Every structure is written in C-alpha cells, then in structure tokens.
Design a protein around this ligand. Sequence first.
Ligand SMILES: NC(=O)C1=CN([C@@H]2O[C@H](COP(=O)(O)OP(=O)(O)OC[C@H]3O[C@@H](n4cnc5c(N)ncnc54)[C@H](O)[C@@H]3O)[C@@H](O)[C@H]2O)C=CC1
Ligand SMILES: NC(=O)C1=CN([C@@H]2O[C@H](COP(=O)(O)OP(=O)(O)OC[C@H]3O[C@@H](n4cnc5c(N)ncnc54)[C@H](O)[C@@H]3O)[C@@H](O)[C@H]2O)C=CC1
Ligand SMILES: NC(=O)C1=CN([C@@H]2O[C@H](COP(=O)(O)OP(=O)(O)OC[C@H]3O[C@@H](n4cnc5c(N)ncnc54)[C@H](O)[C@@H]3O)[C@@H](O)[C@H]2O)C=CC1
Ligand SMILES: NC(=O)C1=CN([C@@H]2O[C@H](COP(=O)(O)OP(=O)(O)OC[C@H]3O[C@@H](n4cnc5c(N)ncnc54)[C@H](O)[C@@H]3O)[C@@H](O)[C@H]2O)C=CC1
Lengths: 331, 330, 327, 331
Amino acid sequence: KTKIIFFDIKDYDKEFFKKYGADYNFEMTFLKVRLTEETANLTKGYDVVCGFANDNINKETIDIMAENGIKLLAMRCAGFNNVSLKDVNERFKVVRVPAYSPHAIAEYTVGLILAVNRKINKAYVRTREGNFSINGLMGIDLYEKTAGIIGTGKIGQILIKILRGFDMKVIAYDLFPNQKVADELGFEYVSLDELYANSDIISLNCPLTKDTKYMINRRSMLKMKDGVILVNTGRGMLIDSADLVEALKDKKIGAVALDVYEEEENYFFEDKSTQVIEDDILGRLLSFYNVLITSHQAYFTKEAVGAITVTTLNNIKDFVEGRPLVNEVPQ
Amino acid sequence: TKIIFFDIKDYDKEFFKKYGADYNFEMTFLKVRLTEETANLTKGYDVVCGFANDNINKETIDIMAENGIKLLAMRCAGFNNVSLKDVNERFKVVRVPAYSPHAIAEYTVGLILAVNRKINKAYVRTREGNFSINGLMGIDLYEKTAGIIGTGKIGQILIKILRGFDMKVIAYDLFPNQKVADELGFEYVSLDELYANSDIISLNCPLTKDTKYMINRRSMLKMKDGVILVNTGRGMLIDSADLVEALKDKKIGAVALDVYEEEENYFFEDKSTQVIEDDILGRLLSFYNVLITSHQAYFTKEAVGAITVTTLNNIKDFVEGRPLVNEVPQ
Amino acid sequence: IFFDIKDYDKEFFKKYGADYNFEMTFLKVRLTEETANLTKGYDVVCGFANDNINKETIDIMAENGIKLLAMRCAGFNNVSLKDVNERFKVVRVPAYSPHAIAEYTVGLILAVNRKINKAYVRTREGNFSINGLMGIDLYEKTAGIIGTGKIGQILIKILRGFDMKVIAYDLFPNQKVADELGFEYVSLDELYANSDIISLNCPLTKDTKYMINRRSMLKMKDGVILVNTGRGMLIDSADLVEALKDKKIGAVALDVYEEEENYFFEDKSTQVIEDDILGRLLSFYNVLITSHQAYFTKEAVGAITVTTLNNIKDFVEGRPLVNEVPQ
Amino acid sequence: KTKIIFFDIKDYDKEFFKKYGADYNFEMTFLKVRLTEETANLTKGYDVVCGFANDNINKETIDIMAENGIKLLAMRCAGFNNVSLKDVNERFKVVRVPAYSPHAIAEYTVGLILAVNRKINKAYVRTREGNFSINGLMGIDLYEKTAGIIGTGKIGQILIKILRGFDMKVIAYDLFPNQKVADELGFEYVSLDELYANSDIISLNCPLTKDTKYMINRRSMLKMKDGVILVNTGRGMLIDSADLVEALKDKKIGAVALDVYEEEENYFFEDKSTQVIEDDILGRLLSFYNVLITSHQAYFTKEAVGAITVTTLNNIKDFVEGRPLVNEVPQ
Ligand SMILES: NC(=O)C1=CN([C@@H]2O[C@H](COP(=O)(O)OP(=O)(O)OC[C@H]3O[C@@H](n4cnc5c(N)ncnc54)[C@H](O)[C@@H]3O)[C@@H](O)[C@H]2O)C=CC1
Ligand SMILES: NC(=O)C1=CN([C@@H]2O[C@H](COP(=O)(O)OP(=O)(O)OC[C@H]3O[C@@H](n4cnc5c(N)ncnc54)[C@H](O)[C@@H]3O)[C@@H](O)[C@H]2O)C=CC1
Ligand SMILES: NC(=O)C1=CN([C@@H]2O[C@H](COP(=O)(O)OP(=O)(O)OC[C@H]3O[C@@H](n4cnc5c(N)ncnc54)[C@H](O)[C@@H]3O)[C@@H](O)[C@H]2O)C=CC1
Ligand SMILES: NC(=O)C1=CN([C@@H]2O[C@H](COP(=O)(O)OP(=O)(O)OC[C@H]3O[C@@H](n4cnc5c(N)ncnc54)[C@H](O)[C@@H]3O)[C@@H](O)[C@H]2O)C=CC1
C-alpha cells in the first residue's frame, strides 16, 4: 500500500527489487528514465521516490517532488552529492545505503590498478586477435612502491589494507585523519602535496563535495610523479577531465582508470554504441592507449546489489512505521 | 666468453646490451626458439642462454655437449623444459630463481579481479561506447575461500595479498611449510579438500611429473560450480581439452590463463596475420569467461632488470670458477 | 502470432500495421516443437528463417487450427512442406530486396580481401600499421557464383562492373541472362578449379546440403575467397575449419552458419558459446562472421513488413495468394 | 652503380624492392624515417631519392637535396601534392607512378562504402565477443540511390563504372570534365553544389591541390543531404577535419570512411598503439560510432605494390639512360 516510484532502473535492479520486495507491503513502479527536472512530474501520486547516483536531484526537481507530496527520497546508493540537500527544507526525508559493501569498491580499485599497470585489458584485445606479442605491456612491481590514498573512509581503509598486503608503502590524506587506524594498517597521513609528490599510484576514495570538486586538476597533476598511475572510483567531478586529457598528452599521467566521469549521467549504464557520443572529452578519453574507462561498476557485485536492495527496502519499511532512520542523510 | 641467446625479443636485447656493456662477453642474439632443429646453431659458443619455451630435450642437449657447450644459462625461474638427467654433467645449468616473485603474485591478483569483475570485457564495451553493465556483475572476494596450489616463493606472497583481502586461504603443497601458514593465516589441506572448498583456485607450483595435468576432468569435477581458476604456473598443469569441457558444462565460472600447454609456438609472437592451428587455443579464445594473456606475469621492469643482471652474473661467476649460487642440480 | 521478434521487427510491424485491422501478438522465442503450443487460439503464425518448423511443430499447429503460416523471409528450407498436407497455407516474402543481399555479399568479399574489419580493430587501438593487410585487385580475377537467381544475378552484374570474369553454376541455367550479363555456365568442378572468389546464392535443399565439403574444397584454388550469404547448411563447417587450417581457404565470410539458430540475432556475449565449431571459427584471423544481416536494410525490412502485413490482409479477405510457397 | 636512398620504408616495401631490384644496376639503401627537413641531410652522397606520400618535400627539404646534388626524386606513389614543385627549379627531375592500379583504390572505396553503410566492421567486433544481435546494423540498399564522385580520373572512372553496376544513379564533378566517358559509363557532370544537394553517397577521388584543399568544410557539408555517406580515399587535406567532427555531431554526416587524414603523416602506417596519440581531432574521430578509419591502404594490393616497384625501378633506369621520362611530374 506504500507506493514507490523507482528511477533509472535496469533489469538487474528490477529483478532484485521484485524478488526481495515480495515480503514487503509495497506497490513498486519501475521507470527507465533518470530523475531530473523534466521527469520529476512523474512522481505525482507516489509516497516514496527511489533515486540513484546519476539522477539530477536539484532544487527544481526537489520543489516539484515536495509539491507532489513526496514523503521519502530513498537513494539506492552510498553517494548523495547529486541531491541539493539545503533545498529539501525537511519537506521530506532522505535515506541512502551507506555500507552495503566497501569491499566491492576497494577490490575493484585494486583490479583497475593492476589492469592499467600490467595492461591486462590491452593484453586481452591482443590475444583475442591472436597477437601474443607482449611488447609495450611491461608494467611495474607494486611491491615497495608508494600508493597514495585520498579519502581514508570505509572504502579507503580497506583499500589500504589490501595494498599493505602487497607490501606497498602507503601514504594517505583525509580531512579527518584517524591515527589509530594508520598504526593498525601501517600507513602515514600526509598533506595532499606530499601525497602528489611521493605517490607512484594514487586512488580517489572521498565523496564529491564543494571542497573535492576538481581537486585533481592541472595544478595538482603537475605535482605528481611523471608516470603516475591514477585511479578514480569515487565521483567523476573529482577530476577536471579536460586537464586530465592534457596531463595524458604531456605524459605526466602514466595510466589512468576511471570508473566514473564528470559528465557520465547521460552515458553510463546505457548502450550508446549505435549513436554519436556528443561529449568531446569522453570521446577523446576513449582513444588514449592508457585510459581505462568502465561504466561505474565498482559497486557492482551480487553481495553489494543484494544489500542495497534489502537495506533500501528496510529504509522504507522503517520510515513508514515511524522508526528511527539509521540511514538518514542529514539535511 | 661467447654467448648465444635464443628466443630473443627487442626488450630482451636492449636490456642485455645495456647491462652487458660492463662484462667481457661476445653476445649473439637469435629470434628462433632453441629446439633440436636449431641446436646446431650453438656451434663455436661457450655459453647458451635459453628461456622458458625452448625445447631442451635429449637431442638438443646431445648436440650441445657435442658442440662443446660449457654452460646452459636459463633467463627464467622455470626449468621443466630442460631434460636434466640427459645433461650428465657434460655442462652446467644455471637459472634465475628469485628475480621477482612479486611480479607474478601481483599479476595473479590482477587476473583474478579482471575475470571476476569483467574488467577486460568492460573495456571492449566502453571503447565502442557501450556503457551497459549487464552481465558484468561480479562477487566480493571478502570472506570467500581461495585455494593455492604451490606454496613457494610466489604462492606465499600471493597468500599474503589475498589474506589482506580478508579471504580465507587454504593451500596444498608437496612440501608444506607449517610455519609460514601460521604467520600468514592459512591452512594446508589435501587437494580434494581444496577443490571442494575453493571459490578461487590459483596454480603456483612447478611443472613436474607429479603436477602434469593435475587439473583435468576428474579434479575439476570436485571443484565448486562457478569456481574462478587462474594459472600463472605452466600450461601443462591443465589438461586444456578438459578445461574446455568444464567451461562448457559451467563447472568453471571464469578462468585466466597466462600460460598454456602448447604455448611454445604462439606466446610472445604476433600471430594475428595467420591461422592459429591449435584447435583448443582457438576455442579457448572464443569463451566469454576466458582471459588469456601471453605469459607476461613475470613481465615487469624490476623482474626483467634482475633477470638480466643475475643472468650476466651467473655467467661471469661460471667463467671465473666461482661457486654457482643458482645452479639447478641435475 | 509472431515468433523470434526483436524490437526492430516490432516497431516496423506496429507502425505499418496501424492501418490494418489486426491484433498482433509478439513473442521473443523461436518457433520450435517446444513453443508450438503457444500458437493456440491464433489464425496467423508469422515465422522467420531460424524457426524449427518440422513435422512436430506443424502437427501441433494444424491441431490448434492454424490457418496461415506467414514467413517474414524469402527462405523456407526450415519448413517441412510435405508435412503441412494443405492443413494450412504457407506464404513468404520472395523479392523484398535481392539487392540488399547481393550488395552485402560484395561488402563481405571486399572486407575479407582488403581486411577492412581487421583494419578497423587496429586503428581503433591506434595501430596504423598495415602489415598483413595487403589484398588483391578483383579486376580480371574469376568469380564463381553458385545459384544464379534473383540474388545471384544481381551479384553477377555488380561483379561484371568490377571487370571480373564470372562463371556460374545453376541446376536450371538461364542462358539468356548469361548473354546479357557476360558470364559462362560451367560445371561445379570447373567453378571450383578456376574461381578466385566463390559465392553461394542457391537455396538450402536436399541437394545443396553440404555441397561445400572437404572434397569440393580440395578442388578450389589455394587462397580462394569464399563467401556464404545463403544458408549455413550449404557448408560442412567442420571441413571448413580443416580447409582453413590447411590454408586452402584464403579468407571466408559467413553471414550464415549451419547451427546458427540458437545464436544468431541474439547477444550471447555473457555466456558460453556451446557450439565448438562456431567458437573455433571465431578465432581465425581470416574468418569474418556476421549474424545473418545480408537482408538487413531499411528498404528490405520495410518491404518485408508491408508484403507480410498485406500477405495477411490478402488472406483474411479470401483473395488469391499472390505469394504462396507451393507445398 | 646508381645510388638510391629510400625513405619511409616498411618491410613489405623493402622485400619488393630487393626482389625486383636484383636485376637493375642499383645500390639501394633503405630508411625507416620519413623524408622531412630534419632528415633531408641523409640524402648526401646519393644520386636518387625515393619518396612516398607522407614525406614533407617542402622547399627546405628540396634545397638541401639539390645542394647534395640529387639528380632525381622518385615518388613511389601517384600523388605528388607533398612536393613543392615550384621550388624544384629543375635542379633535379621528379617522377611518380601514375597508374599502378586504379582498380585497387576504386575497389577499396566500394569496400568502405559498404562497410560503413552495412556496418560490417561493427558486426565483426560484436560477433567476435559472441554478440550476434544486429540491432543498429540496418543499412540502405545502394540500388537506385545517387552517388556523387568528385574527381573523374583513372580512379574515379572505375569507381563510377562499379557503382553503375550497382544500378546507382551517378553524378560527378571534375575541373576537366570528359563528356565522352560520361556517355560510355552512364553518368552526368554537375556542379559541386548540385552534387552536394543530390548525393546520398559522396566519394573524393581528385588530387590534393590549392583548389581542393578543404573543399569539404562546414559550408559544403551544410549543402549535403542529412545522413550522407562520405568516403575519402583521396587525400586527408581534402577535408577540414574539425568541421567533419561538427558535421558528425550535428548528424549531417550519416557515416564516413576515411582512408586518409589531414595530419596523418606521423601516424599512418605506424603502430602507435603503445603511446599517446597527440593529435586531438584524430583521437576524437576514432571515438565515433560511424567513423571508419583505415591507414591509407586503398592502394595496398599485391598487383598495385608490384607495379609500383617495377615502374619505380624503370622510372629510374629510364632516367639514368637519358630516356624520355613518361612518368615525369611536370614542374
Ligand atoms: N564507483 C562506485 O560504484 C562507488 C562509488 N562510491 C563513492 O565513493 C565515495 C567514498 O565512499 P565511502 O568510503 O563509503 O565514504 P565514507 O563516507 O565512509 O568515507 C569517505 C572519507 O572521505 C573523507 N573526506 C570527506 N571529505 C573530504 C575532503 N574534502 N578531503 C579528503 N577526505 C575527505 C572522510 O573523512 C571519510 O573518511 C562515496 O562518497 C561515493 O562517492 C561509493 C560506492 C560505490
Ligand atoms: N607466468 C610466469 O611468467 C612465471 C611462472 N612461473 C612458474 O612458477 C614456478 C616458480 O614459482 P616459485 O614459487 O618462484 O617456485 P618455488 O620453487 O619458490 O615454489 C615452488 C613450490 O611448489 C611446490 N611444489 C613442488 N611440487 C609440488 C606439487 N606436486 N604440488 C604442490 N606443490 C609443489 C614446492 O614444494 C614449492 O613450495 C615455476 O616453476 C614456474 O613454472 C615462474 C615465473 C614466471
Ligand atoms: N543471408 C540472408 O539474409 C538471405 C539469404 N537468402 C538465401 O539465398 C537463397 C537464394 O535467394 P534468391 O536469389 O532470392 O532465390 P532465387 O529466386 O534465385 O531461387 C534460387 C536460385 O537457386 C538456384 N538453384 C536451385 N537449386 C540449385 C542447386 N542444386 N545447385 C545450384 N543452384 C540451385 C535456382 O535455379 C535459382 O536460380 C535463398 O533461398 C535463401 O536461403 C535469401 C535472403 C536473405
Ligand atoms: N588512398 C590511396 O591509397 C591513394 C590515393 N590517391 C589519391 O587519388 C588521386 C589520384 O587519383 P587518380 O584518379 O589516379 O588521378 P588522375 O590524375 O588519374 O585523375 C584525377 C582527376 O581529378 C581531376 N581534378 C584535378 N584537379 C581538380 C580540382 N581542382 N577539382 C576537381 N577535380 C580535379 C582531374 O581532372 C582528373 O579527372 C591522387 O592524386 C591521390 O591524391 C591515389 C593513389 C592511392
């Protein structure tokens, strides 16, 4: 009887929500379109809206939603940078799924590092055509190199542990360093500049905020070591992509793996192979021998997707029963 | 001192020229693999430098001793491809045993995650502008069981890394080392227990008489359905034909092979403008869940640097009558 | 009732059908003996080239009172006609666009000769080396066409424009057309011995099944370029693999494949391809496989939809059957 | 005896020139580098220089060559746009191979048309991964469509004949129309503007000159039919590539095949797959779903390459024996 409208849905999302939703007393409607100001009108008559990471939940969208009497905005993801929280004004509540599986993203990040370092993705395309030459595929041992992690949160700290198992030296930067964890894991907090100057490999694992937007830009990349391997499974807006293209052309950047991209919203998760990709930077990034782009799949495991579904359904059950909202996103 | 090198590529040559400039050697580089058909080209040389895919059987060894070869220097850790009994001490054999175990262990982890998370497939889709991720869902390695076969230099580093993923690790070795298993946090088990309880299995033992085709129809029937298998050891560890069947019957979830049982005429060479004659290799290349890379687990700067220097020193040490630290006993 | 439907099929049939007084039901699944039961309560069953319309399927269909089998294709080798027994009628679309297939055939020839597909994969990765991509001029070479029909004749005309010499084999030669087009009928053996390029454009029948097999390929010139936009069963695929391995076959393009029915038109990129020969064929440097898309142009598909839609409109109005397939 | 220096050589070139050159009284030296001002010095002590399509044979290069006493410049190609003829003040002679195989290029042009129309290259990349879906691969019948050929020379005429065999209607533009050939082939000369307005398919087969440089640019592409299929096996400089990108993005261009590219000289024929492609437009062109780029291989058949080698060697023999130079490029 609680009526739920879901945006940006794929078949994998739907199957999970139908299966696990069978034990909840919900009406579930599934839409393919992203939630934006153009589609916000479709929320009319629903109690709960379920949004995802690439929905444009700006003021206009939020106004139309409150106007339509929406009681709850449920985000089926850990990120909320794309919802303009100040504009909600407590006219409805916002919940997210914060800890479905930090391991999924940390593990993926390690995958991406090794893929671009050891050029696994290029190897595969060669051996498929029967090219078994390995010229140009030489990488570097991670062992005893320095990895620099920006964001020592749930994901960042698991990433650090893994890398320490590789016997990498790890340095890290966080707005709120946690020295205890550093002693347990065996890593040293440093400034951003020290991280840039000493890191052979750099990974972004902080949220997108006003302070992190474009934190990786021409100026910060000039401070990195030539041949630095950079990986981003955070948010696309962490990197000024145009500057990334230049730092690739300058051979500052040894290789880069991007699971997210600043203007990904009309592309990612969709098969755009039969039309023009209109974003110039995205097209150009796809033509670099040492760029690996994957469509925001760091989160994408069966454990992670399972927990997102269950935690999302419970977030909603908990709201309708007037229970305390453990996964509220404070506004 | 006159050195004949087989199976050489430009990356090998450049390294051996750069670092060999300090040593008093004549160095001749050949592209061709060392086999019975090419063994005759060793005539007039003091030292032969061989590599992992050379066929150094009795015929090859006989022709070499006949030509007065003093030293066989292997620029690799593996020596399964030298028929040691047939040497008869007519010349010495040296290898480079520990250039970089990290290179291979690290690459092994790279393969696991690539096939699990479909990173190679992702790339091929996004390059064509297909950003759909349907079918690319993987599994968290966290709290799964990895089973390592071969707890040597490489296998032990692999185990440590995976323990960092908080995987449970079980292992099998012909010569268990219980002490390392206590430090690392893993348990030796029989092969049968490994097969039954492993979500991921990695092969890191040498190719011997005992390991040849250990992974075959019968042992794969004991694995968990959906098992992820990775081989950076030797290709002959797997009966490849059975592997094909175990893929087709969906016993195998995904597999990454950095080596292959008949790789000798393919690997390291660009065969993209001719027929691949080996039927199994062609067929393996057509499976959605098979990742084949051309024996590049070892292939890092550090590893290749250390192979070159250790090889050149193996040879310097032999010619100066020094004790051979890296002899392979025969 | 429509089988083996894809979104392109559905959009066309809805757009053009929205004039006609029909209720149309669309199914994704192929028509086989397992799915034939789903025809219950329908009068029009619309089938396509890879449906298994054997006796069991036909029996279940007649049992369910099926009035018309409408084939949205020109080929009908997959419908066991003798078993229908006139318990319902069969219509096809015979001439929607012979040009579509003939033109595509020429595309394939040139793609495998000049390595265009391999070129694309290289340049996409920034490999602009053209080593191994050398081809041959078609000019003054000999092309051998098996099946001089609607498609075969247009193929011949195009190739004659390339100034290729053309020879051809047909069970029912048409000497006239040979004089207009400038080509010579020969035996199969002569075709095999003198052809640099060979194309198959005859129907799959009892007599053409496996006509390309180890024995006939041994008669071909080494380095022959072979293209098949006919039916997969024209080639013994296992022998093709051998003739590729022997380097008898210079390059081959297959738009059709003998066991294509559970693969073609479907995205199988997230599961095992169980057919061993198909997997193996995909690993050869000089094999080009496309998924039965020689017919696939907007004119062809438009004409298929209209001719089909008003093949049905001409059945329900008790009109004579302009496009039947005689049993 | 006669000493020949060859630039921009690949193994295929060398094998042909060694095989066929064994009968001629020549010393033959092979270099990998392109002939530019930076390399022109390497001509010192040679009688004959053999150049190829992407050599930068400007005045500086020509001056350094005449200074070194070079007697003959032999181009192993039909194009000569890249040699600044006015600057060669008859201080040496220039020969080319004009008619090695017009069929090779015309045939390849037809291959490209059908590949981008019927998506054969995209089909291949799909089926290789076991994607047999044909959605998005629908093309058009060429039958009864209009093809527009710019340049009715040796190549253009054979192209026209072939297309007439497809029963296409053909129109053509040439600076020097040949009405007789039009009557034999069945095509009509028209203005460029009429060609742009009525062509479904357009092919470029004129030389690169001062008059053809950038003839295909924003303005001319605005006159084409929406969804036009464009193919260029002429010269890269015939197209303002930046405008091409825009005309692709705005969907004026249905599909394009480029065998040549305006800044191809440091890329084409070379394996650049293990480094950054520094040219932005080329990278971007490689990321369009409906762009097919091949590396200047329209000429590349065994008959063509054979004839280039023999005709080149005879051009040179004929020069040294004071024979009249039938393949001189008038300066
Ligand atoms: N690609 C994908 O599928 C996924 C991406 N994400 C992204 O990864 C991000 C990290 O997530 P968690 O580890 O769960 O977040 P978290 O909220 O546990 O930890 C983030 C850490 O970043 C730090 N931080 C905050 N602002 C900072 C600043 N201005 N500079 C440096 N550090 C700062 C905090 O101290 C915190 O420790 C999420 O915000 C989300 O954007 C999350 C899940 C999946
Ligand atoms: N893909 C690549 O590029 C490379 C592959 N390798 C392969 O890995 C092996 C070298 O590995 P390392 O760990 O450095 O060698 P190692 O000698 O350090 O370790 C070998 C381990 O396997 C064990 N072993 C021997 N027979 C066994 C059996 N039947 N069952 C289980 N374990 C057995 C040994 O007892 C030892 O614990 C080589 O033999 C080679 O075949 C080595 C280098 C590179
Ligand atoms: N790949 C694709 O998308 C398409 C494939 N086709 C295939 O091509 C075949 C021919 O199509 P159409 O030219 O429209 O048919 P058609 O109108 O030409 O009739 C078939 C021709 O094949 C000849 N033929 C019959 N038996 C023969 C034998 N034993 N040996 C040699 N030749 C023989 C006939 O004499 C006739 O000239 C179709 O039956 C179908 O299988 C048709 C349409 C599309
Ligand atoms: N992609 C490749 O591999 C190859 C490309 N080419 C290109 O194709 C051209 C050679 O074609 P061919 O047909 O052998 O040349 P051709 O010299 O036989 O014919 C050239 C035609 O272009 C016409 N033309 C000249 N200036 C013109 C202008 N300003 N506007 C319009 N038309 C004009 C001429 O009247 C003549 O009909 C070369 O000049 C070269 O640029 C040639 C060989 C290979």
